[PDB]
Design a protein around this nucleic acid. Sequence first.
DNA 1: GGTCAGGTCAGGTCA
Length: 596
Amino acid sequence: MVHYYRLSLKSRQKAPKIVNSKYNSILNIALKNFRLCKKHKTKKPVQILALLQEIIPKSYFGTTTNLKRFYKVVEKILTQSSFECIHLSVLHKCYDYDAIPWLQNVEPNLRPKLLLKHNLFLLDNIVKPIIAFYYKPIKTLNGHEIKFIRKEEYISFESKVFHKLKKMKYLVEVQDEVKPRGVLNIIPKQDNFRAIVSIFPDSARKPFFKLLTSKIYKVLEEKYKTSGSLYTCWSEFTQKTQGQIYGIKVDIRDAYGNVKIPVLCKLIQSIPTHLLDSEKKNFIVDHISNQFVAFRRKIYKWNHGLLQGDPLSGCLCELYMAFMDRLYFSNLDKDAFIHRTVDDYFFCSPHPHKVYDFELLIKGVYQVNPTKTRTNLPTHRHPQDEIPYCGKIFNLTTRQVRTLYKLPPNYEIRHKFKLWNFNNQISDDNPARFLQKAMDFPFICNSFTKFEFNTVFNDQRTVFANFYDAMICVAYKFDAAMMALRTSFLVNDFGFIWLVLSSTVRAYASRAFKKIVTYKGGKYRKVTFQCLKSIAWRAFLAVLKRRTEIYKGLIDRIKSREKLTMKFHDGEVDASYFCKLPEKFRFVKINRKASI
DNA sequence: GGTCAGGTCAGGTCA
Ligand SMILES: [Mg+2]
Ligand SMILES: [Mg+2]
Ligand SMILES: [Mg+2]
């Protein structure tokens, strides 16, 4: 019933010094070297693969091919995605049992389970602990990517910023024995850091916190009418404005930290008693007024703004910023466009000076991140026509909007897709359910909306390029899923690949059609259902080509058998873009190699 | 049977 092994470190166990009667004594040799390895200073850089080869005797696998099979799991662990799993069957299936010396005495039909439990034993008591001993996993928050850093380096970085947080009196030792609400975590974010609190589980009170969060959001509904859909605001303003659009995006820095609690507390108290009674009012007030945080076996008062990671901080910060909005942006030219997400403001106007004035307005009220500022003002140092905002790329000159893709160079795209679900597991004999759950539409649903498929302000050329780019992503997910089928399902029958493959292509083109015609626009000429199918299949073509020999059968099959049109009813579309791979996805890395 | 509204779950988006 349980077919999965989680790759994550927290699964690890603490090794006994001696193995029990149900395990073969060879394990104790391994454990010995483990202990001795821990006593190594290991000041210089270390490769975990290497140390394991000097911890687990080759005599345990016997043959190099057996050893390589096991280390291929170790490699997956060292390069793991959050939530990633393998099939427990991987740990015993396809091994050369003749070459394993300590298994010759036992009858053949009992060897796989034995090998499984011994390989499980090494993974839980030696492999994961050794990775944990020298490294800390931090989640980059780009997809499910996990970066490992040396414990010596993270602790120094965590100590440096801890002192900074003490000298600036953001963190102040309380020394009153007050109960901490959670543990402070310092996480690395580029050159900076993020101080957040991980809240101790509060089973009997988070129902209460959902109630207070709900009531705050009710307050934000009643006062301050809705901001507009971002799509409707960009639609109307583009229709309104016939001249060259001018715009700016500014990034407010540390919005949670720059909230003035005294001002926030007065907003809380001013809520009408029918909305929020005085007891609840006062509970929120001493909640944000007494933030207590546990660092290294010491309790501190967080004294700078709102605590990130706390459940109330989001709605409470939104309430503060909503109040700041009218204090300073209630009166702006109504022929202008403005939108705010949480700490990001996007403002556009046909007049440059009003965009210029907006930058000064915002800078006078808030501390911003100047490197994160993007603007088409001609005078500015580094002007651009493309403004990234809220997951989209807005071209102020063309008015076209494209999806924004966060794929740094050398990012491993398999981190974008969570293909394993521990709560609902798929057996190693059932590969098809795995692949089709992978191709559930919901995962790309956010790039199949009116914003990318409208023709109101969007050209057919960019609506196509949007659909292609999304499909490129679905291909990359298909690809990652295939490697999962190869490396842990160990499938040999790839015949079942086609049905859902093209079965997904159909529905995706179909899913696009209904959106596109639901949001017909003035630039809409004519788009053929079949053209979307030709685009989807050409998207897969461009991706599947990265590992041609593995898929050369597949590429040839649909390359010939299936039909590529690109005769869409528009002449502007280069159609050249569809044949190749967009530069964004040329530079992403689909192979797995350990580096720690 | 065919809807609805509500509920769960899921992999995704925004800061
Ligand atoms: Mg929640
Ligand atoms: Mg920011
Ligand atoms: Mg929010």
